């Protein structure tokens, strides 16, 4: 039965990245402009100095 | 009286007899008899003994089957309309 | 969102677990390194004895 | 001779840090989403309406 | 399924060959060791590494890839490197004898004895795949052993498969810059060969990478490895499609059918748009318009081409990331009108859009940017002709003078052959300006 | 029941054998001593081993094999070995004289006061044998106590029982490599007179077979332990029907009635697929598909010929382990539409499936692979003739002028017998050519 479940697991990880694509949606309504890009920066400038 | 069997040459006479002999740098390698002492009589003749070969030829190259690509701004057939 | 943080956090520990042989190994090779130079060193102490 | 001593002392603090880590993530990696799985669906949870 | 084979040959294609791979084993979170982490993901070979490597029930994934050189230098350190383990060892076919930059010696003295064992992997390689779509291939104009070797293979691959594709990835010689004096006999004899079987052959050029690199990435000293990122970036953006999805996918037979306009000529040029330092993008915004100026502003192409002196033909654009149609029609639209941009008046429309909702992720160590909004221009205009007329009239000079021609008379060649190329080279030119004549 | 009757001539047609049992007696865990724990296996000698071994109501596992040698050397060595308590002094046939290479020496000399002795070995064997399906002949073609004095019994063992099967099996002469050159002579000896007495001889060449150890195996010094070891796993494999079951069980009748097509001609080619480093086959992985391809790889046959020089008329696959009818059969379907795989037209199939369940077991000691999927490929084609061909112009060239013929004429032949054996020969090619040509 646990092949049962774990079909269920794979549309449990579907679902999600449905509502992950719903953030995505707002994502791209933030992406617009973004801001975890500002905090990639700042190790990729940290690691420029070193 | 039996005839001795047409020695069948599925190869061999040509390839295999001569595959042994041809794969053969002998009569060279540990040494010779002697070195024949080169006696001071002379050398090259003015820069001969060269390796220059100027051939000549126009050897055709593989087919490209791939046909001429376009067809030099010319017309098929259209416009063929009735009333 | 239960599930998603549970799969964030097994990732991140697997990592640590990488970075914990990539240290192992080299500690390794440098102490073999060490004992075999401390070896020439006694033998460098007998030399200088002669 | 010193600074080797070190060494080996620096190695097994490694190697227990491995041995805890390992049995972290047998039990973590396996008993959750295992019991996870029985999760009931979402019309039966709205009662077979 | 959609799988494919990548083969790397010069010495210089199999460093390229690394790094590719090395960023390939990063999307896939592959440790060096070869396997995954507890993490069920291993099987019957079946998941996204199935169309990249070979995760058998072994648990160890097998990158999809014969590594061929003739020099047991590089592929002996590559050996001792971090992922050899993965590696299989006679995929990384070595060789003792190398080319000495002649095309010929790497097409006659040494290519027989080794094409057969080559040959094997490669059937060996044909039984295990189920799709196999076409080949990945990796070479240089300037092969010191790319040249020969890769021209006889390719002829034999292509005589027995003759039903897939194959596609070819070569650095174009530097057009003021020459490393090797007996690079333009070779690169023309590279050309003329490749034209009747190769499929489609993409290029590019160092000198404008290394333009970019302290244009926008700011970088005044950038390295191989850089240079290795945005090549192997260029094509892990193109096999996206392949990895993850997207609104359409798209398959390189699209790709085929719909950039070629006509035989022979199958000579695209891609492009990155999104390349900038990190900081530049740190204060700034990036969006679909103005990446499309700028994959469209002439001095952003790796070939030193200006596009105002040809005119375009097709052109493919492949957005990986977050888009929306909204903007992308708009834009183009802005762009299809747009005066500058001399598009044969053949082609109503000459786009091809791809989309892949996965963003394209930094690689540890890395230079790039951060991009969410990126697209691989590939495109095709006229404007290539003058690097073939730049080839030609060196070509013409020193061909007249026949130097070095002791050296490939001496091992067996003659000039024959060096006389087809350049009227198969003028039959390329004279193509290309009646294509450009309407 | 099932059993047979194994023989060993030749002085080094011994230590080969001496491996058989060795390897034997792992897989039925027999110790040293000569008998089981304390667990019940014993009676009057009817389990696994009443096939091979007799394990009386002394307890005692007696092999069914006489080995037969003409030099005390290497048969008291191994009498003072360490499973000579298990072996029967006198049937561990020792000899005081030598052939000195000399066929007729042995057919002669001495062969007539030692083959009464053991005859009596086998007579007495067989008095104590039920069904006795046929006897298992090693020897050597450069025999230089195999090749006369098998002769002279195979003759004996023939006349007398002429209802039973006899497999023979001899390393075959090595092609360009001759530790003797009087070898072409004794052994077309041998043929001649074995080709109308002969059941099925097999035959294996020791160059290939190290061509494997560093092929695949990835042994540069393998040595005879492992030679022997690849052999007997060969024979063991074959022998894997008569110890275990399978999805289909066959016997040896069958291979004799479907191996053989037409009178004379009993000379097919076996070979072993997972032939595999331990290290290797620990990160590939094995399947019916590429063991197939292997299988039928030109390079893995253990017979200096080239496959598509001839063409094929059998194939045996004796698939031990786990294997499935359908990959089985739709992996073969796809061996039956490759072009370059050239069968006779007479045979539309020509395919013998043999099905165990067991894996193939391991040695302690061993540097043998990790097998759940083995196959012995038991073949006959056209492309043997070169190996005739290649003696007959080495034999006619000495024949001429004579050499070593003061040897033989000296102690008591004539050369009409020597000019016998070459229109013998000469039979057989012109038998080969006609089978060959459609
Ligand atoms: N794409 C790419 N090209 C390189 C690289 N390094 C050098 N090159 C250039 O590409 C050419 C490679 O051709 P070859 O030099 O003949 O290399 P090869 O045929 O593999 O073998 P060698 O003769 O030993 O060098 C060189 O002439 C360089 O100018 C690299 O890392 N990647
Ligand atoms: N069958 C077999 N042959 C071997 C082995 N090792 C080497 N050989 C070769 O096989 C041949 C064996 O035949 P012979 O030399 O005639 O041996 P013999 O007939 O038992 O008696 P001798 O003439 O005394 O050696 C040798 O010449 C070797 O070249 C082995 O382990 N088994």
Known sequence: ?????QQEANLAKKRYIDLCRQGRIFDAR????????????????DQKIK | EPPQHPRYTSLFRATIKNDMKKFKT???????????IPSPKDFLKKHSKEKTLPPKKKFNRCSPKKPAVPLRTDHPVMGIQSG | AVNSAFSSRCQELDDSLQK??????????????????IAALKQAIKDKEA | EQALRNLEDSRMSLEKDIAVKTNSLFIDRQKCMTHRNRYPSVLQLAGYQ | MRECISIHVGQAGVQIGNACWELYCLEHGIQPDGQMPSDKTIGGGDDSFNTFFSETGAGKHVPRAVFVDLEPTVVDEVRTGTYRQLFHPEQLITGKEDAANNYARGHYTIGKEIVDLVLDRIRKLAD??????????????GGG???????????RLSVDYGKKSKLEFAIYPAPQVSTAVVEPYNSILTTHTTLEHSDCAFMVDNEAIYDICRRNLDIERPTYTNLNRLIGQIVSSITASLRFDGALNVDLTEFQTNLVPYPRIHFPLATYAPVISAEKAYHEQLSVAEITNACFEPANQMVKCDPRHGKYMACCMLYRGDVVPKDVNAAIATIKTKRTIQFVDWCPTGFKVGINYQPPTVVPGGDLAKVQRAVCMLSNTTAIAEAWARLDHKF?????????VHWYVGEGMEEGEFSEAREDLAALEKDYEEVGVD
């Open chain 5, 145 to 155: 052993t790319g040249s020969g070797f890769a021209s006889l293979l390719m002829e």
């Open chain 5, 128 to 141: 295990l795949c189920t799709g196999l779509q076409g080949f990945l291939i990796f070479h240089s104009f």
């Open chain 5, 396 to 404: 013409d000079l020193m061909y007249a003078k026949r130097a070095f």
């Open chain 2, 26 to 36: 002998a009569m060279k390698t540990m040494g010779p008899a002697k070195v024949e």
């Open chain 1, 30 to 45: 933030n992406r617009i402009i973004g801001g975890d890009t500002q905090a990639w920066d700042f190790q990729v400038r």
């Open chain 1, 1 to 5: 039965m646990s092949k049962d479940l």
């Open chain 3, 20 to 37: 914990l042989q990539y240290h192992l190994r080299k500690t390794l090779t440098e102490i073999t390194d060490q004992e075999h130079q």
